[PDB]
Design a binder for this molecule. Sequence first.
Ligand SMILES: [Ca+2]
Lengths: 359, 178
Amino acid sequence: APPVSYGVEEDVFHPVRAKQGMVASVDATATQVGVDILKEGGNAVDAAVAVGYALAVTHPQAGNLGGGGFMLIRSKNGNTTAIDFREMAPAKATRDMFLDDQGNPDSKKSLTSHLASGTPGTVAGFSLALDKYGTMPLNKVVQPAFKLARDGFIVNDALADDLKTYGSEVLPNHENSKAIFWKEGEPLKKGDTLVQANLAKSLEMIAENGPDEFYKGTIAEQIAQEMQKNGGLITKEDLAAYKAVERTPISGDYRGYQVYSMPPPSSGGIHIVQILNILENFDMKKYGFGSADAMQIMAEAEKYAYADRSEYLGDPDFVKVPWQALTNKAYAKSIADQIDINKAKPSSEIRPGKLAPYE
Amino acid sequence: TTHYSVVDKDGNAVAVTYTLNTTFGTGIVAGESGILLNNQMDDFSAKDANAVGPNKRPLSSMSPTIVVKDGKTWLVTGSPGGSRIITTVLQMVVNSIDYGLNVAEATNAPRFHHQWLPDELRVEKGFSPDTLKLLEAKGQKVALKEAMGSTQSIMVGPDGELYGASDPRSVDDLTAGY
Ligand SMILES: [Ca+2]
């Protein structure tokens, strides 16, 4: 492992610089919400929750209350944890629920119908995090998002372009979605104001009553009704049963660095660590960025990892994932020893690895 | 999908990746709540381990990641992009550790990706024609495709100096501090 560079004036690309706190996100407004929380004395979790609520308003593309995700937290004292707030399949979900007449997957059913939705975990995960690791009450961290929803904000290029391109495919097909995101029969465009009054109500009531508003209260009733009336599965029982799960992060050592990532149900963290384990056997710094040699080694290492990924992963509440064997450095060496810098191995000759010696 | 990173003055750090699945998800708002509903059920295998079942979480490539150096938080990162998340995050780490690139250099650097199947080395624009010809000579099947990722990352100096980078691939994004 060579010396690191934090940045010098001589570089082509310059990092943003700060002395105290920082936030990086896909949306300027949400980033600024997070910085302001930190300015006012909130901790990283406090600001993370505020940014997540902000994006649920300013980045409806992916920021959300109606979806889910993952968080990694590392505290100042070195404790690193993972919060899994991935959506859960409804209790009424079935193995063949997406198959048509002929036994073939129906892509539209799992993408644009009411059966496409899992029980949302975001509000649960944010509150698990805030209650355990934050310092501020939910009402304070939701307030910025509340104001943005109630008062509106100006549509920018990113949101305008997404509304026209991806939004057109799904939003105007539904009265109530069209009522929010369309104006006078066309998508909101750059310079228009997006006001989200119904979403402001939801946020107001979450701030007032806590996450139970989403899982047991008025929002829960609104979700269940939307599902019942339209052939969906998410019930009030599903919403009341939802729980976010704190989990142990996957970790590896790479050249003296400790790398922490998301464990199962992430199919990614384990394999970032695995690929790093493989790469540790090579002098990567010697080949250098964008060299045929480095790209060859990494492409070959990735193949083995992706082949294992296809075989050994699952929801850990349902299956035993051999994470110890997959992150084992002897196993990684056995892979490294197969890599030929001068000859790419066709994927047809690569299979999931034999893990038994490393279990 | 979207990823954001936070570091506070006390050295606490948070990395969040969260999603509706596709852009705007189903496009269905839940009645009068103003909330768009996910299409996360598509992430199950429709036709063993990741098959649809009740009360189950569909597998996700989402990988919020924190790297520790000399005992302290050093890199906070993550990205959208489905299976490409693994290689995007991997390139952030490799760029920062092996190549000694600052968080902005690491971020603006071009990305490549091999996911075993399809059997192709996927690239963005920005690799030398000389290097790609060499990769073809090694057996790699090079495939020039669209930009991968939207990393939103923070590097932390031992002294608490913070260094951030938003992806050029996403317009209207921001890394900021105080
Ligand atoms: Ca950008």
